[PDB]
Amino acid sequence: KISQYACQRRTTLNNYNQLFTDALDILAENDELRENEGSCLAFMRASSVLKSLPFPITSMKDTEGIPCLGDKVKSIIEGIIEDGESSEAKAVLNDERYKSFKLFTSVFGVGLKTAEKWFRMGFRTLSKIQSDKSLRFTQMQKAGFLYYEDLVSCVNRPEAEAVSMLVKEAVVTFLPDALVTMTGGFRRGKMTGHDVDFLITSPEATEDEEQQLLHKVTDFWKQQGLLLYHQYHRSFERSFCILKLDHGRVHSGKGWKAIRVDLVMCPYDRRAFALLGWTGSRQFERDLRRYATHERKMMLDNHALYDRTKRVFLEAESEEEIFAHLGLDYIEPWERNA
DNA sequence: AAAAAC
DNA sequence: TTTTTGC
DNA sequence: TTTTTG
DNA sequence: AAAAAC
DNA sequence: TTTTTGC
DNA sequence: TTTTTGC
Ligand SMILES: Nc1ccn([C@H]2CC[C@@H](COP(=O)(O)OP(=O)(O)OP(=O)(O)O)O2)c(=O)n1
Ligand SMILES: [Mg+2]
Ligand code: NA
């Protein structure tokens, strides 16, 4: 009955198995850092499936007929039932390598590789990293260290409501017909988020007006001294930012907060695919594509859906129509929290 | 790690 | 040349 | 056994 | 995209 | 996938 | 490196 695919599941933000999901989330993180990619996904899909249950697990008979729960996962579950916690997860949480990875990757511009690079140099604290004269920091790592306290506290719903107003005012100044949609975790009903994700598309605007808007907005914020960081990408068209949000703009110190803002600019003909692809979650995204490939012999990505059998690209003006192409029951954004 | 011959 | 960062 | 896992 | 040299 | 900066 | 399902 319950599917192994997050796209065939309704997952709201009401998790009755947080005890188990937290333990599986730690063990999947440990395997991601130890590069055991296979095992890492296995715990991520088991953690995901339990978030969809409309009740807490209180016995091993409750695990009956749930997919993705094999011999190992059932062991982690069983241990949490008897001793109230996972010995496995506890041993990981206390590991020197795991502790480093988490502290290091919390800095914006530091991933698994640099975290391991710094660990293989004997670094365990951020004070030691910053104190070092010999170390060479990238432009991103510099902003991550500069605005560390603000970026380590997640973005809340009123702060995201305010940032949405900044984007709206900026975008409409250079493209009045443009449509601005808040994507990511906030579209999915979340109250926290590491950043504020946006999707911008213009129906009337030209190609020239399209390949320049993100520059015109980021330069607009630059002039006002709001642009704390910017990294541009062209292909869709993406701009990763760190913005200065003044407390006065938030509808309820230093007077402002540094906030990560992800702005995607897509062509108006691909907005349904971009909206589905940037809403998330990451697990719903991969299970949608895994379903398309293995169950329907189709190819789904952020810009198009191709049917490999009918040898055609499928058109869609809404997310409703994409689920329909794939033979899936429509899952509203707030039921995509896999 | 758990499926799937994915 | 390959690697690293960001979804 | 090997393959896949967005 | 833009560095950094992992 | 194409800049720049160093080793 | 493990177990399951189904040719
Ligand atoms: N590996 C990833 C990461 C992200 N995304 C998509 C889905 C969500 C969207 C925005 O990504 P995030 O910034 O990571 O935001 P979020 O997942 O919604 O959560 P958070 O609140 O932490 O930003 O990009 C994805 O498909 N695959
Ligand atoms: Mg987000
Ligand atoms: Na990081």
CATH number of the domain where residue A26 is located: 1.10.150.110
Q: Is A197 part of any known ligand binding site?
A: yes
**Half-sphere exposure (Cβ direction) of A233: Cα atoms closer than 13 Å:** 12
Backbone φ, ψ for residue A244 (5° rounding): -100, 110
Over the Cα atoms of chain A, what is R_g? Answer: 22
| Residue whose C-alpha is closest to residue A88's, from A98, A76, A70, A72 | A76
Which position has the token pair 């499936």? Answer: A49
Instruction: Note the helical H segments in A195-318.
Output: 207-210, 213-223, 271-279, 282-296
Q: Hey, is A102 helix, strand or coil?
A: helix
Q: Is A189 part of any known ligand binding site?
A: yes
Question: For residue A130, what are the contacts with CB-CB under 8 A and spacing of at least 6?
Answer: A145
- The domain boundary residue, chosen from A243, A268, A293: A268
Task: Tell me how far CA of residue A237 lies from CA of A68, A199, A254, A278, in angstroms.
Answer: 36, 10, 33, 13
CA distance A74 to A20: 10
Pairing mode, if any, of strands A256-265 and A196-201? parallel
Same domain (yes/no): A170, A241: yes
The reply to whether A39 has its C-beta less than 7 Å from any atom of strand G is yes
Residue A44 buriedness (CB in 10 A; 0-12 / 13-18 / 19+)? buried
CA distance A232 to A263: 10
Structure tokens at A127: 């004070």
Same domain (yes/no): A86, A111: no
Tell how far the Cα of A308 is from the centroid of ligand 2, in angstroms.
32
Structure tokens at A137: 């920091």
Same domain (yes/no): A212, A253: yes
Residue A206 buriedness (CB in 10 A; 0-12 / 13-18 / 19+)? exposed
**Which protein residues have a CB closer than 5 Å to ligand 2 (ion)?**
A 184-185, 193, 195, 197
Calculate the dihedral angle through the C-alpha atoms of A202, A179, A274, A282, rounding to the nearest 10 degrees.
150
Same domain (yes/no): A306, A223: no
Whose alpha carbon is nearest atom 2 of ligand 1?
A: A282
Give the CATH number of the domain where residue A132 resides: 1.10.150.20
Chain-centroid distance, C-alpha A109:
16
CA distance A284 to A112: 23
Task: Tell me how far CA of residue A277 lies from CA of A92, A157, A301, in angstroms.
Answer: 32, 21, 7
Q: Is A184 part of any known ligand binding site?
A: no
Look up the domain containing A219 and give its range.
154-268
Report whether A242 contacts A258 (CB < 8 A).
Answer: yes
Same domain (yes/no): A168, A205: yes
Structure tokens at A60: 């091993």
Same domain (yes/no): A248, A314: no
Calculate the dihedral angle through the C-alpha atoms of A72, A77, A79, A84, rounding to the nearest 10 degrees.
160
Report whether A331 contacts A284 (CB < 8 A).
Answer: yes
Same domain (yes/no): A181, A237: yes
Ligand 1 site, residue A278, Cβ cutoff 6 A: yes
Please tell me the total count of domains within chain A.
4
Task: Tell me how far CA of residue A1 lies from CA of A66, A103, A164, in angstroms.
Answer: 8, 40, 39
Report whether A237 contacts A264 (CB < 8 A).
Answer: yes
Resolution of the coordinates in A?
2.5
Report whether A204 contacts A188 (CB < 8 A).
Answer: no
Ligand 1 site, residue A194, Cβ cutoff 6 A: yes
Tell how far the Cα of A142 is from the centroid of ligand 3, in angstroms.
12
The DSSP secondary-structure symbol of A304 reads: -
CA distance A151 to A229: 12
Q: Give A197's strand partners.
A: A262
Same domain (yes/no): A11, A105: no
CA distance A20 to A78: 10
Q: Give A306's strand partners.
A: A299, A313
CA distance A328 to A207: 34
Whose alpha carbon is nearest atom 7 of ligand 1?
A: A280
Same domain (yes/no): A240, A338: no
At residue A195's C-alpha, the angle toward residues A189 and A200, to 5°, is 80
Active site residue A62: no
Query: What residue has its CA nearest to the C1' of D4?
Result: A38
CA distance A268 to A259: 27
Question: For residue A136, what are the contacts with CB-CB under 8 A and spacing of at least 6?
Answer: none
CA distance A314 to A307: 7
Q: Which long-range contacts (C-beta less than 8 Å, at least 24 apart) are formed by A30-35? A: A30/A92, A30/A95, A30/A98, A32/A112, A33/A97, A33/A98, A33/A101, A33/A112, A33/A115, A33/A116
**E strands, A167-236, where?**
179-182, 192-193, 196-201, 227-234
Q: Give A230's strand partners.
A: A241
Query: Which amino acid does the sequence have at A255?
Result: G
Residue A86 buriedness (CB in 10 A; 0-12 / 13-18 / 19+)? buried
Chain-centroid distance, C-alpha A14:
18
CA distance A52 to A309: 32
* Method of determination used here: X-ray
CA distance A164 to A245: 11
Active site residue A197: yes
Pick the ligand that lies closest to the CA of residue A194. Answer: 1
Tell how far the Cα of A326 is from the centroid of ligand 3, in angstroms.
34
Structure tokens at A63: 């695990």
| Residue whose C-alpha is closest to residue A194's, from A262, A146, A137 | A262
Residues in chain A: 338
Which position has the token pair 């929290």? Answer: A337
Same domain (yes/no): A3, A64: yes
The reply to whether A38 has its C-beta less than 7 Å from any atom of strand G is yes
Report the nearest atom of ligand 1 relative to the CA of A184: 18
CA distance A269 to A183: 18
Residue A248 buriedness (CB in 10 A; 0-12 / 13-18 / 19+)? exposed
Report whether A178 contacts A237 (CB < 8 A).
Answer: no
Q: Is A187 part of any known ligand binding site?
A: yes
Maximum Cα interatomic distance, chain A, rounded to a whole number of Å: 63
Ligand 1 site, residue A284, Cβ cutoff 6 A: no
Calculate the dihedral angle through the C-alpha atoms of A308, A313, A317, A323, rounding to the nearest 10 degrees.
0
CA distance A41 to A283: 10
